[PDB]
Amino acid sequence: VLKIISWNVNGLRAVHRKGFLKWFMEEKPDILCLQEIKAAPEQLPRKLRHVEGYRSFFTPAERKGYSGVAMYTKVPPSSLREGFGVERFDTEGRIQIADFDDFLLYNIYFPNGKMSEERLKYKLEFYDAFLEDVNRERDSGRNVIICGNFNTAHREIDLARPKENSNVSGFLPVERAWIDKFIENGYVDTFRMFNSDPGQYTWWSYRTRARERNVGWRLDYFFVNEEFKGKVKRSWILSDVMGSDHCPIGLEIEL
Amino acid sequence: AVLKIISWNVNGLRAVHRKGFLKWFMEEKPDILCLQEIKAAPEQLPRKLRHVEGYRSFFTPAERKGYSGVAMYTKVPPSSLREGFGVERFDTEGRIQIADFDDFLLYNIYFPNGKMSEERLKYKLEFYDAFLEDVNRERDSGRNVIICGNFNTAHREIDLARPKENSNVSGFLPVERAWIDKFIENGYVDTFRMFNSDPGQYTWWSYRTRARERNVGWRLDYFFVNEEFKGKVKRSWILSDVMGSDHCPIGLEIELL
DNA sequence: CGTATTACG
DNA sequence: CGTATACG
């Protein structure tokens, strides 16, 4: 079994100050995917770039201190691709696609659509660009694992206040429909394979102290292509790991 | 009666508020509180910071957002408050309040820091010149004056822990030290030194080197009076245990009648 | 070091 | 609420 953890850390330097490395060394994932690092490698301490027993990969945005994704792994991939082949989507530090032979691992920080209509439109086009790429690979016979911050709660069970958020980016009908479509394209929301409970969230607003009252949203997911779903042994939420407004999520994969 | 004035370069009034400023303020209960480097306009402050029970507040922010700025809280409001010397470049940086309490004028002044450039050192020195013309005109007209705030210069070698290594650092340049000498010769008295002639008495310490815990400091904050008023000064002291900023507060007590 | 700026979330 | 250039 291989353990993969995904975490939108909302600042890698920030979580580092809070004890990221202590947590990392206790949890011992085989592969760790991070989103929203808000750093390029040259701004990171050495102990963050060089972690014992892991190869690290950093894919920053062009804009300083914005977005960015990272991957640490005990076995290195045979390749790592950092975009879809579309400039506007490939320069925000949102995409790592690592080839582990048994599977391709997509580590994706999907755009947030809250700030503006243009950014909602960018988010939905990113979604489409993502789906084209992953389908190309799956069709070629590759098995695929996708984790990261999708920035959308899929169904009503996936946030504490569905009614109030019907017109808020993150629970818009159009966004929820893209996830339906993604699933209908042959992919499985792994957490829902094992847990059909409500109150299971991965993000809580800092602003209203939402975490202590568990007023959250499930924005972070592990998906696999349906042909690969038999190899998924566990999908869970690391609810109690603090340090970010998102908590980590986990996947156990056989082979 | 006995009047207590406290001066404090807070380095962010919202910051000190978050650290317990109002609690300290209620404990100390000065008659007048002068603050420098508030880094805020009144609209950025909560209502309870704008209006403290028993005090009237006067905020004089810089044109630039979150930069500089001075404020004053007083139990008895002044008859008038002037917010400049009448020189535009000196009057737009939120550095000047001149309040008339009838018995005296109180200047609450955040003097400029000259460390960043030659341009800003020249600015500081010209601001010193404009300040001296102002206070002299008021004094010459028959007013007693109290001047407090952050002068941004340690006067003598006793006024900082490391005088030699700062001989060419703004804050301890011969030209700056000489200006304080000149201000004094114009008929003004550094009140702290009326009562305390010891070394190790400082009001500012660098955050960057954790200087405060080793007391590697500078005396940058002062209360001056015109010499004719000095017999009214009962005490002048440093509130060195009061945390929350890289400066500590200073105090003056005066007795009128 | 630490408090502001503005952008983003 | 909190994590990402200017001044001091």
Side-chain angles (χ1 to χ4, degrees):
Chain A
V1 84
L2 200 154
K3 184 198 274 187
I4 310 179
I5 303 287
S6 181
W7 191 15
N8 191 112
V9 296
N10 184 41
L12 184 52
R13 289 170 281 174
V15 292
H16 181 232
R17 285 188 295 270
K18 295 176 192 185
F20 173 74
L21 295 169
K22 183 174 172 284
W23 169 79
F24 191 6
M25 260 32 194
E26 181 64 277
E27 189 59 36
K28 317 187 228 306
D30 297 291
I31 310 187
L32 178 60
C33 297
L34 306 179
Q35 309 88 37
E36 202 178 16
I37 295 298
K38 295 182 162 212
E42 59 272 24
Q43 303 168 289
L44 304 175
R46 288 171 179 216
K47 276 153 182 153
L48 225 36
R49 289 184 283 100
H50 307 293
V51 181
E52 247 265 72
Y54 294 88
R55 293 213 45 193
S56 61
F57 296 95
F58 303 94
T59 305
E62 289 187 341
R63 160 132 80 132
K64 187 186 179 147
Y66 178 76
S67 182
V69 294
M71 188 182 294
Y72 295 83
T73 180
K74 283 185 181 185
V75 190
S78 59
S79 76
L80 190 138
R81 167 158 70 84
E82 289 171 303
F84 298 148
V86 188
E87 194 181 353
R88 64 201 278 245
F89 295 139
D90 292 4
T91 59
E92 282 191 23
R94 297 193 178 274
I95 307 154
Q96 294 176 326
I97 307 166
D99 193 334
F100 294 100
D101 171 56
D102 273 13
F103 58 83
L104 293 176
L105 176 59
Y106 285 66
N107 172 29
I108 318 293
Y109 173 32
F110 289 87
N112 194 278
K114 283 177 201 280
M115 71 164 282
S116 82
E117 201 74 53
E118 195 177 11
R119 288 307 294 179
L120 181 60
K121 165 181 197 276
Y122 181 86
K123 181 187 181 176
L124 299 165
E125 293 176 359
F126 189 96
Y127 268 174
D128 290 328
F130 161 71
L131 188 63
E132 183 179 317
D133 192 283
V134 73
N135 283 345
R136 206 223 298 105
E137 299 280 356
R138 188 271 322 274
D139 288 347
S140 84
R142 306 302 313 272
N143 289 328
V144 293
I145 299 178
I146 308 96
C147 60
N149 175 5
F150 282 73
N151 258 310
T152 302
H154 180 204
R155 302 213 268 236
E156 296 200 10
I157 193 171
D158 295 314
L159 70 174
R161 308 291 194 256
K163 300 308 130 53
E164 13 282 336
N165 292 284
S166 42
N167 204 45
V168 174
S169 178
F171 205 50
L172 291 166
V174 66
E175 289 162 322
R176 296 172 66 185
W178 179 84
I179 296 173
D180 288 329
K181 163 156 99 150
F182 170 33
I183 285 161
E184 292 160 8
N185 271 252
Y187 308 89
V188 181
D189 178 347
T190 63
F191 179 72
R192 290 310 184 192
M193 288 172 175
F194 296 92
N195 192 332
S196 54
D197 295 338
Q200 307 298 303
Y201 308 127
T202 67
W203 178 83
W204 304 260
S205 178
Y206 278 130
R207 264 172 286 196
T208 83
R209 234 82 88 239
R211 198 176 184 160
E212 57 207 39
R213 287 143 39 242
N214 191 42
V215 182
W217 301 50
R218 192 163 68 96
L219 304 179
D220 302 274
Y221 305 77
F222 269 103
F223 287 83
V224 297
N225 59 299
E226 62 190 356
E227 303 92 344
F228 192 47
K229 85 163 197 66
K231 309 319 280 187
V232 175
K233 296 317 141 196
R234 193 184 177 204
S235 183
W236 77 109
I237 298 165
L238 293 71
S239 298
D240 291 333
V241 179
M242 308 305 294
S244 171
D245 55 351
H246 292 253
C247 69
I249 56 169
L251 188 83
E252 297 285 356
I253 194 84
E254 172 182 46
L255 312 214
Chain B
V2 164
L3 207 150
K4 178 154 73 159
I5 312 181
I6 297 304
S7 182
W8 192 12
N9 189 110
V10 293
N11 189 38
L13 175 59
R14 290 167 283 178
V16 291
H17 170 62
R18 290 189 299 271
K19 300 174 196 191
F21 170 78
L22 290 177
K23 185 163 180 270
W24 171 77
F25 187 8
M26 283 315 87
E27 297 173 344
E28 189 64 33
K29 23 167 167 292
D31 294 280
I32 302 167
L33 175 56
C34 287
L35 307 181
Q36 304 85 37
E37 204 176 17
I38 64 173
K39 299 186 155 210
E43 21 296 307
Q44 300 176 291
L45 308 177
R47 192 178 304 115
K48 273 199 269 266
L49 192 52
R50 300 175 70 165
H51 301 283
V52 174
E53 187 162 54
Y55 288 87
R56 282 279 295 281
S57 70
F58 299 92
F59 294 97
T60 300
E63 60 166 79
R64 180 168 169 179
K65 187 184 165 164
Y67 176 68
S68 191
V70 290
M72 185 181 291
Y73 296 83
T74 180
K75 302 197 179 165
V76 174
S79 60
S80 69
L81 187 105
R82 179 158 58 91
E83 295 171 301
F85 301 148
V87 179
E88 202 210 319
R89 73 192 183 275
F90 297 144
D91 293 2
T92 59
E93 288 197 9
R95 292 186 177 279
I96 304 155
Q97 298 175 324
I98 300 165
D100 191 346
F101 290 98
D102 298 331
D103 299 300
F104 57 90
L105 300 178
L106 181 59
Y107 284 65
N108 174 23
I109 308 293
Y110 176 25
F111 290 87
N113 188 286
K115 286 171 143 65
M116 89 168 263
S117 64
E118 287 181 48
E119 178 171 78
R120 291 303 289 182
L121 172 63
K122 177 175 149 94
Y123 182 84
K124 175 183 185 187
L125 294 174
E126 298 177 347
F127 184 107
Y128 273 169
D129 294 337
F131 158 74
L132 186 57
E133 292 206 358
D134 197 276
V135 71
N136 279 345
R137 172 194 38 89
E138 290 289 5
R139 196 274 319 279
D140 287 348
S141 85
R143 304 306 307 274
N144 293 308
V145 295
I146 296 174
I147 306 103
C148 66
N150 178 359
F151 282 66
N152 260 306
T153 300
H155 183 205
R156 293 167 176 164
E157 298 196 31
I158 195 166
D159 295 306
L160 75 172
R162 308 288 200 254
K164 304 81 42 226
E165 34 276 283
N166 287 292
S167 69
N168 204 47
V169 177
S170 178
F172 203 60
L173 296 163
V175 61
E176 298 166 318
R177 291 176 68 188
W179 182 84
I180 294 163
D181 285 337
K182 190 174 82 167
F183 174 34
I184 297 174
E185 291 311 301
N186 275 254
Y188 306 88
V189 182
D190 177 348
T191 61
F192 182 66
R193 300 300 187 191
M194 290 171 53
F195 307 101
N196 190 311
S197 53
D198 293 343
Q201 310 302 295
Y202 306 140
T203 65
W204 177 80
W205 309 258
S206 166
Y207 271 141
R208 262 128 137 186
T209 55
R210 304 167 26 165
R212 192 178 185 154
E213 53 197 85
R214 298 179 286 114
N215 202 40
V216 178
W218 303 52
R219 202 167 58 100
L220 305 183
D221 297 277
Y222 298 79
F223 266 103
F224 286 79
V225 303
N226 59 305
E227 64 199 6
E228 302 87 346
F229 195 68
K230 76 176 227 172
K232 306 295 173 182
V233 177
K234 302 313 137 175
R235 65 190 203 107
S236 176
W237 73 106
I238 301 174
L239 291 77
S240 48
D241 287 357
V242 171
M243 311 304 306
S245 164
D246 52 357
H247 299 245
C248 66
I250 57 167
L252 187 72
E253 304 204 323
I254 64 160
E255 290 217 48
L256 288 337
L257 286 316

